Symmetry: D2
Subunit: 325 residues, 4 copies
């Protein structure tokens, strides 16, 4: 009795095409339909009773929070059904970490939710998408995969949505969680589970988004030498509810950034200090403005802050979410 | 006879002094004088005849291009002297990669220039700065260190300014070049040189800023889901000469970012597409606006773009610099 | 109020003294007593009521299974007391992964057991041992630390005994688990727990060795081009019960190694195929002789095989241990 | 007008075949002929005028020094011809680091020598070998690739034979040089050169192995708790000329290992202390027996020690080879 798996397609390079097999840059993402992906790796049909559903077909640099919200709602609907055992979501690599972390916080099920992506288009020589998709279906259909939070499967690895990130612009092995590792790996058609994330997610999460149609506006500002105050002013003037700061080092702030953050706080904007570095802990520091992002990178911090702002604007409550989610 | 090494101090956590040995976060960077750093490691007198000079005493999140330019000019003056064999620059960790890469491009000497920094303040239990400084003096004084480009020495490693970056907010081992490795290591009081960088630098660089007192203004804008067009408008309106884009994946651009970039281009602003990921190549793509950053991360790309704009506004010339520096 | 923590000292570089602060590669491991370690970082007394006990004082390349057996027995006796909340074990770095994984399998308590070590001797400039010890006491005394399996704390990281390994001969940051990450990190005097290991250990382990005064003999043989049959013959002749093979790639075997493994199997030895590579899965392959090590590296595989052989010689039972511990 | 490249085939998983696309473990390495590999990627004919030559067809765990000698001799012959611009050598992954380093030391040419391999067989879903082979031909035919030492090309990366190693049993991204990085990368059909290795190789090497048909015998012994003296005795009795020790930590030796090494030294065996850890420097230590391996891992140390012994048994000369090659 095969597991029943929905393959929910959103686009991405995994569905991308170019004229020739040697073109691995500058191709069209989000060009092929979900059934074409399935039928390119028909071994998936040995692992599961699969059903393709075309949710969207875009390059992931164009994925937007209002669309991710709809995606989360659709996945929750699917997983409430007795005839669905898990869902695989085909997505672009550029922003999978954002979409996956959003669903990690908002899907109220222990059934597997497995994002899958590809760094080479479907037409490329040695395209990675076929094996990635096979692995993702294997993970989604395995009873041992339940209760693990949302996963991102690619290049034989299983990453937690909370930790995994695209670390390299262009390589197949780009998805890594340097300090936290992988939840598991898939080698020789077998899953090896290594870790369970020690954070709240899915069925233990407070972030209910049923019925919503919009999310709080959050922008991300970079930290660097000579960083300007005017970008703070511009964000404030355009109505942001939060600013995530991709800070120098451990969320450190220049005199110009401090002035911009104090203006934001005066206007009721929540300021969250993360890091541009790529990894590690931004620790509390009562001498600096704003909250701190724990080990969340800027992209992830923005997603959690948007969701936090659906429930509260209390900085103490938001800070505790950042230490527990 | 021993080498003659100038220790040119700019501040940083290496010169920071907290109230207790356990405080490693929330201390004051840039408090101790250069001679106090030297006198904490009097072993240095066995490696070199050292002289301290106090250039500045600031936390590196406050280092600015106008000041970095002065630092480069002062180092050029020092290295023009026959009685100086190399220079060690004590600096904060947060923006050492920016200052070091600027000097890498503008120092007109083959004599060693070694930036050194610390992740723990000088007061801390197991502070790293004492050993880092001893290692940096050993590197700067070794004849085999000549002609290597500017170096960053910390935690037993020798990094090229072009590749090294602070990858972790808070750990001792934060400086890494994941794809390019270290130029060398220092183990057991001995230097092991591994690589020479295959890029132009120092005495083979066209960038000369000895007749300047400031650099062209360049800002950095992040890429993420829902990234706003208005931050492009704000940069344009505040007189930027260049914009570096810390892009999704391989410099990929949303419909909003493309509209922003096209406005910038129409105003004569140079747009340079880098990556937020942390590593790897942004490849050319004629269907997208702007130039591409090769393997330069956003912080490094901004430094090179500022220097490029002192010489040309021809995008073909600038693009070639980004492939060769 | 404060937790009661026993510091059980075995030796190591953390207890080493050299003649100068620059000696980092020629000093003596296992020279200072436990109260000298404690009184050198007296800040531990603010985290715990600490009591030092001198178990041994040796360099860890000389640690032996018979002594590890006694260490495990003593830790079990300490943790059986109601007045002991946790134990920190000071140990050498070279074989901490072996001792720690043994206790991970044999300690019948959920109270924390934290191994700590140092890469520089106690006399070194920027010695790492003081901070590592302070961190280890913090981890051992935190209620959140219970039930995590045995831990190795060093360089601000908390590694599981099952995954952590010494990856570099000589650096402070040598302990890593590349594919599995860290259980947690210690930054700014705060613990950040990231993962729980998804394997059996401690109170859920079958490997009780209380009462033993000896262990099964298990040797490790390397795989390489031209590897010889005669080392298998020698091991058999000297009474091994098991051989761990540090194999080429995924436990792959030359014609000579296969001949040696077949002789061992003929002579009643259990053969376990691991990998020399450093990481990853050795998958089943029924066209090759012997068992497979899953993601256990050679040093860890030897420990598990030795303990397995106190309970069984059944290959199916042993193979399932390797997939679950 | 195109470069002339010989594809010299030796076997490996790149030439492997299985009965289904999902079998990625347990397959037959060295099953397919070189022209089958070429014909799978006729795109190569746009990069180069290629000619296949079948040297051998074996799994690389079975590659032996006598055969590597013949490989080096053949490559030297090919590169002496005006009508050969470079050579691509198809090889198994398990021991490519050994064969490649041997040729790095013995091929007296600046023309590119590029080893290529695959982690999945040619029949696998998302097999890596087609793109790896195209990339290797691109590298071998580019003028910019001359004088770089022997290279290993796989997974978009260009590794030096002296630094690259198989770090994972089973993943596509297994070849890494953690401390030294890659010489270059291949992205979007373009080569990005990053580093030149700062070591002696190829045209500057003293290791002349013309007329030789065999090499001095060198075995590798592991270091671990309870390591036995009798394996040294066995190696001595079997006539080894060298022993490479894959030591605990920084080549550290137990009381038993010391006794074994002193027996070996008394019989005129050269003892070379490397590390089992995976990375880094084994520093000199006059209180321990034998020589030290610098940053060479055990597999590379054995290759260099064998070749060293074709010139001398003087331990000070051999030590200097280990610091310079």
């Amino acid at each position: 009795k095969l597991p029943n798996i929905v393959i929910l397609a959103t686009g991405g390079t995994i569905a991308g095409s170019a004229a020739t097999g040697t073109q691995t840059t500058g191709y069209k993402a989000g060009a092929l339909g979900v059934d074409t992906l399935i039928n390119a790796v028909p071994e998936v049909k040995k692992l599961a009773n699969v059903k393709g559903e075309q949710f969207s077909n875009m390059a992931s640099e164009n994925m937007t929070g209002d669309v991710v919200l709809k995606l989360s709602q659709r996945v929750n609907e699917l997983l409430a059904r007795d005839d669905v055992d898990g869902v695989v979501i085909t997505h672009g690599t550029d922003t999978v970490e954002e979409s996956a972390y959003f669903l990690h916080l908002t899907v109220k099920s222990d059934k597997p939710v497995v994002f899958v992506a590809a760094m080479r288009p479907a037409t490329a020589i040695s395209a990675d998408g076929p094996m990635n998709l096979l692995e993702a279906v294997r993970v989604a259909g395995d009873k041992q995969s339940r209760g693990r939070g949302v996963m991102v499967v690619i290049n034989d690895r299983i990453g937690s949505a909370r930790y995994i990130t695209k670390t390299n612009a262009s390589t197949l092995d780009t998805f890594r969680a340097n300090e936290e590792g992988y939840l598991g790996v898939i080698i020789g058609n077998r899953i090896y589970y290594q870790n369970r994330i020690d954070k709240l997610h899915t069925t233990r999460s407070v972030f209910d988004v049923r019925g919503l149609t919009s999310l709080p506006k959050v922008d991300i500002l970079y930290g660097y030498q000579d960083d300007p105050e005017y970008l703070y002013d511009a964000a404030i003037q355009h109505g942001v509810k939060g600013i995530v700061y991709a800070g120098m080092g451990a969320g450190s702030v220049s005199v110009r950034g401090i002035a911009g953050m104090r203006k934001a706080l005066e206007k009721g904007v929540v300021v969250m200090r993360s890091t541009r570095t790529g990894n590690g802990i931004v620790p509390p520091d009562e001498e600096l403005p704003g909250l701190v992002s724990d080990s969340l990178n800027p992209a992830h911090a923005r997603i959690l802050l948007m969701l936090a702002l659906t429930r509260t604007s209390d900085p103490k409550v938001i800070q505790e979410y950042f230490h527990t989610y």
